[PDB]
Ligand binder design. Structure first.
Ligand code: AKG
Ligand code: MN
Length: 202
DNA sequence: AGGTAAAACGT
DNA sequence: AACGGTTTTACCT
């Protein structure tokens, strides 16, 4: 059984590419550091984030925004690593989205207990473009629902190297990550990373 | 009028 | 601890 209409999980798709992806996460973070963003309501997110590529997802007092500039450093986000772009392209093609051209990569870091409450990815103007989501390190429970918040949830363990792609009919589906369980991974030591690729511009 | 804020406590 | 209330409102454009 596939995940949803226009959605698929590619298990261990990024396993072989993982070590290089993690080196490149470190390189990106050396320029635009991980930070826990503050919601408009004034709460600090448990997930630490940074971005690469032309546009980066951020919180602001007025809401959420994709920006070409890191508001912390006041410099552009680091360029999207070739390893990121190549993996994303291969995953998108395998998932049935061969024309996907991302211009934005959000890098999430989960410490033990870190979560991402059920939400939609909707800050992007071109809804024809899919989401490519790459898991690295410690395993996490991914929630995948429907168009409405109360739509029944699928719960899927996402392990190191797993790639999830959604778009088309499932593009605006609610999804999230349950509080991360503590553990060890030889490549990340004590955390989970996630790479979320999007077309956020035109 | 529609979009977005909640990507964030009680049972 | 899975589910759902809150946005059951307050501001922008
Ligand atoms: O960490 C994940 O697997 C999901 C991340 C996510 O939903 C997001 O960054 O919008
Ligand atoms: Mn998301």
């Amino acid at each position: 059984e596939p995940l949803a209409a226009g959605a698929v999980i590619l298990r261990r798709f990024a396993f072989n590419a993982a070590e290089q992806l993690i080196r490149d996460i470190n390189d990106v973070a050396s320029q635009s550091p991980f930070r826990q963003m503050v919601t408009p309501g004034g709460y600090t997110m448990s997930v630490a984030m940074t971005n690469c590529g032309h546009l980066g997802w951020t919180t602001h007092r007025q809401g959420y925004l994709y920006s070409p500039i890191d508001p912390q450093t006041n410099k552009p986000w680091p360029a999207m690593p070739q390893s990121f772009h190549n993996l994303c392209q291969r995953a998108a093609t395998a998932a049935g989205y061969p024309d996907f051209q991302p211009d934005a990569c959000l890098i999430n870091r989960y410490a033990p207990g870190a979560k991402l409450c059920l939400h939609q990815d909707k800050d992007e103007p071109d809804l024809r473009a899919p989401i490519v989501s790459v898991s690295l390190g410690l395993p996490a429970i991914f929630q995948f629902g429907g168009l409405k918040r109360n739509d029944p949830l699928k719960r899927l363990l996402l392990e190191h190297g797993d790639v999830v792609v959604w778009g088309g009919e499932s593009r605006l589906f609610y999804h999230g990550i349950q509080p991360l369980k503590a553990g060890f991974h030889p490549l990340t030591i004590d955390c989970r990373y996630n790479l979320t690729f999007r077309q956020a511009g035109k």
